[PDB]
Design an enzyme around this catalytic site. Sequence first.
Site, PDB file in Angstrom:
ATOM      1  N   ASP A  86       0.818  -1.219   0.000  1.00  0.00           N
ATOM      2  CA  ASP A  86       0.000   0.000   0.000  1.00  0.00           C
ATOM      3  C   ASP A  86       0.855   1.273   0.000  1.00  0.00           C
ATOM      4  O   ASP A  86       0.477   2.271  -0.624  1.00  0.00           O
ATOM      5  CB  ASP A  86      -0.935  -0.015   1.226  1.00  0.00           C
ATOM      6  CG  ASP A  86      -2.298  -0.659   0.912  1.00  0.00           C
ATOM      7  OD1 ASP A  86      -2.437  -1.363  -0.124  1.00  0.00           O
ATOM      8  OD2 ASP A  86      -3.253  -0.427   1.691  1.00  0.00           O
ATOM      9  N   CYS A  97      -2.028   0.099 -13.530  1.00  0.00           N
ATOM     10  CA  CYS A  97      -2.122   0.149 -12.075  1.00  0.00           C
ATOM     11  C   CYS A  97      -3.350   1.037 -11.827  1.00  0.00           C
ATOM     12  O   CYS A  97      -4.366   0.820 -12.492  1.00  0.00           O
ATOM     13  CB  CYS A  97      -0.806   0.612 -11.447  1.00  0.00           C
ATOM     14  SG  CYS A  97      -0.045   2.080 -12.306  1.00  0.00           S
ATOM     15  N   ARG A 127       3.629   2.338 -10.917  1.00  0.00           N
ATOM     16  CA  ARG A 127       3.960   0.918 -11.053  1.00  0.00           C
ATOM     17  C   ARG A 127       4.051   0.487 -12.520  1.00  0.00           C
ATOM     18  O   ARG A 127       4.934  -0.265 -12.885  1.00  0.00           O
ATOM     19  CB  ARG A 127       2.924   0.074 -10.310  1.00  0.00           C
ATOM     20  CG  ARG A 127       2.827   0.473  -8.812  1.00  0.00           C
ATOM     21  CD  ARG A 127       1.741  -0.309  -8.098  1.00  0.00           C
ATOM     22  NE  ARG A 127       1.428   0.309  -6.790  1.00  0.00           N
ATOM     23  CZ  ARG A 127       0.409  -0.082  -6.010  1.00  0.00           C
ATOM     24  NH1 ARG A 127      -0.398  -1.082  -6.365  1.00  0.00           N
ATOM     25  NH2 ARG A 127       0.188   0.527  -4.868  1.00  0.00           N
ATOM     26  N   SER A 128       3.083   0.874 -13.340  1.00  0.00           N
ATOM     27  CA  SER A 128       3.094   0.482 -14.753  1.00  0.00           C
ATOM     28  C   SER A 128       4.370   0.941 -15.436  1.00  0.00           C
ATOM     29  O   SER A 128       4.916   0.233 -16.308  1.00  0.00           O
ATOM     30  CB  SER A 128       1.905   1.087 -15.486  1.00  0.00           C
ATOM     31  OG  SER A 128       0.685   0.628 -14.951  1.00  0.00           O
ATOM     32  N   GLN A 173       6.640   7.403 -10.536  1.00  0.00           N
ATOM     33  CA  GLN A 173       6.074   8.554  -9.850  1.00  0.00           C
ATOM     34  C   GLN A 173       6.868   8.969  -8.604  1.00  0.00           C
ATOM     35  O   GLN A 173       6.583  10.030  -8.049  1.00  0.00           O
ATOM     36  CB  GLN A 173       4.598   8.270  -9.509  1.00  0.00           C
ATOM     37  CG  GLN A 173       3.628   8.676 -10.651  1.00  0.00           C
ATOM     38  CD  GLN A 173       3.604  10.193 -10.866  1.00  0.00           C
ATOM     39  OE1 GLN A 173       2.890  10.902 -10.124  1.00  0.00           O
ATOM     40  NE2 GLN A 173       4.415  10.716 -11.833  1.00  0.00           N
TER      41      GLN A 173
HETATM   42 CL   LIG Z   1      -1.163   2.266  -8.287  1.00  0.00          CL
HETATM   43 CL   LIG Z   2       6.377  13.235 -12.814  1.00  0.00          CL
END
Ligand SMILES: [Cl-]
Ligand SMILES: [Cl-]
Length: 289
Positions: free
Chosen positions: A186, A220, A226-227, A267
């Site tokens: 998480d 995701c 994640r992707s 990210q």
């Molecule tokens: Cl996500």
């Molecule tokens: Cl970014």
Amino acid sequence: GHMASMEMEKEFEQIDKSGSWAAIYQDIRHEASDFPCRVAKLPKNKNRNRYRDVSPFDHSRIKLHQEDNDYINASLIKMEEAQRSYILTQGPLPNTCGHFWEMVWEQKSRGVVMLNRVMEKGSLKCAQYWPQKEEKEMIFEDTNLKLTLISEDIKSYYTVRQLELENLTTQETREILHFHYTTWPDFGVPESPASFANFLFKVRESGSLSPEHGPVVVHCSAGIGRSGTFCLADTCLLLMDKRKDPSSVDIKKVLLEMRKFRMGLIQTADQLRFSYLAVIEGAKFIMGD
Ligand SMILES: [Cl-]
Ligand SMILES: [Cl-]
Ligand SMILES: [Cl-]
Ligand SMILES: [Cl-]
Ligand SMILES: [Cl-]
Ligand SMILES: [Cl-]
Ligand SMILES: [Cl-]
């Protein structure tokens, strides 16, 4: 091969020891492409976007074969040198599951890669877009698609499902493989880069990444963090095998190339770091180490 692995591990150690991940990640953010997302931002498409700040660039977006409205929040990532393509998309919405499977059908995809759970942190990250029970198939009436769960193989870090996708208009049927990485935490990144590399190898072993099929569909919740980690690690690993001398692969440059096709890929600095770790582990496995 050996030289690419050595240089990769070297560059990792140097970044890690000098505490440079956040600075490197900020540089990538500052250098990344900006292209228009005019179609995504049209008023009629507001209910097709999960997040107001994550949109596909017009130039790389996937178009549904629809007169009504061709828009879906999905981007074709086309890696010329590595000869790999990926469709990165947000987790489907309650009203975009038919569009999602229409895209899978139209693009001739063999695999769907899911890197999130339907509920995370107490909130819905993705609609329940596939059937959980063999005897309860799903019908997408807007796009005339039927989807049946055929079987699933539940492992400790991921689940693989065999799905049958049927175009009700033509009665053609296709087998789709659903590769579900179920244990990304998480908060933060997985503790086992090896589990994620192993997961990537299972996707590869199925043929889902292969040029005989349309591009794999990877998602995701927003389809960028994640992707992005998944496709960045896959492409970097391929390049480490493809290249001669110098054999070395620059992850930052590969990520900036990918961000030409969808915004925001990877990210956080921690996801950047994890990406290096998964690549390193993957390469050791490939070399029989
Ligand atoms: Cl996500
Ligand atoms: Cl970014
Ligand atoms: Cl509009
Ligand atoms: Cl490439
Ligand atoms: Cl789930
Ligand atoms: Cl993170
Ligand atoms: Cl490179």
